[PDB]
Ligand binder design. Structure first.
Ligand SMILES: *[C@@H]1O[C@H](CO)[C@@H](O[C@@H]2O[C@H](CO)[C@@H](O)[C@H](O)[C@H]2NC(C)=O)[C@H](O)[C@H]1NC(C)=O
Lengths: 122, 49, 108
């Protein structure tokens, strides 16, 4: 069992913040990287960034650079992704995804979370 | 010296051995004079997750 | 991002393909050009990772190669289990992955 138990849906006002958690289980949490990838319900799939529990080094796309901050928590074996301003363009389900490789950032992911929805209100 | 290593890696701490620990963490020279001492510490240095 | 054709047809027991295009540091640029299969309402799972190889548990009926400055993931002998979106991917350089739009494998 390598399932990633991810938090439930959240509803946030426009412009406000939100943080989403993924609780890792089964596999060794320290080694394998954790990418963050978003899917708007209307279209496609877009990647944001990753944070590795082995080091804490974080990288992002240019689009989300500065606007979003990521962090780890090895005590409960979980990773947190914070979005500062829940803009209405960011209403999406947010998938956390484990990289398929041991200690390299190589960009392909095996196992994905069950789906944490996020909504921007009106 | 003092360190904590994985259980199958205790054979690596010996002169002339090769591996990840023996080549990247702690290398004993081939002319080593001394004793290597180890014991299991699963019940005293580990926690669930 | 990776420009991509929108759809592909088929029927159970046939052959079909889904392509992803781009060359400037795109899918034709590097070798880490993995694909994914996403059903609606559930998480996706990667069926073709780097260039041509398949993960453990993936059926061998899927195939993939760069075929130049592009990509192609095919399906042979499709069934009801193989209809989903299919997203290409790449490095695209300097720690900035980009995905494609996604073609929906539809069987008549
Ligand atoms: C993620 O990695 C990329 C790849 O190096 C970083 O992009 C470079 O960052 C340096 C920082 O001084 C800039 O001088 C370069 O111009 C950047 N390169 C490009 C192509 O933009 C990026 O900064 C990293 N991000 C984080 C948060 O570490």
């Amino acid at each position: 069992q390598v399932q990633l138990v991810q938090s439930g849906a959240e509803v946030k006002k426009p412009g406000a913040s939100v943080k989403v958690s993924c609780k890792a289980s089964g596999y060794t949490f320290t080694g394998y990287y954790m990418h963050w990838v978003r899917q708007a319900p209307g279209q496609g799939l877009e990647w944001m960034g990753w944070i590795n529990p082995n080091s804490g080094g974080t990288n992002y796309t240019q689009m989300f650079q500065g606007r979003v901050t990521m962090t780890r928590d090895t005590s409960i074996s979980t990773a947190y992704m914070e979005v500062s301003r829940l803009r209405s363009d960011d209403t999406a389900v947010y998938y956390c995804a484990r990289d398929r490789s041991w200690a390299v950032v190589y960009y392909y992911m095996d196992v994905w979370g069950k789906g944490t929805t996020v909504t921007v209100s009106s | 010296d003092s360190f904590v290593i994985r259980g199958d890696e205790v054979r690596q701490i010996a002169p002339g051995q090769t591996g990840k620990i023996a080549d990247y963490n702690y290398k004993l020279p081939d002319d080593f004079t001394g004793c290597v001492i180890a014991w299991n510490s699963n019940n005293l240095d580990s926690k669930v997750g | 991002a990776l420009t991509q054709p929108p759809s592909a047809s088929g029927s159970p027991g046939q052959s079909v393909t889904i392509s992803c295009t781009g060359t400037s540091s795109d899918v034709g640029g590097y070798n880490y050009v993995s694909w994914y299969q996403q059903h609606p309402g559930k998480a996706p799972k990667l069926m073709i990772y780097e260039v041509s190889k398949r993960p453990s548990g993936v059926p061998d009926r899927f195939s993939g190669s760069k075929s130049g400055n592009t990509a192609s993931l095919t399906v042979s002998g499709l069934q009801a289990e193989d209809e989903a979106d299919y997203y290409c991917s790449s490095y695209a350089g300097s720690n900035n992955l980009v995905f494609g739009g996604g073609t929906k494998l539809t069987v008549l």
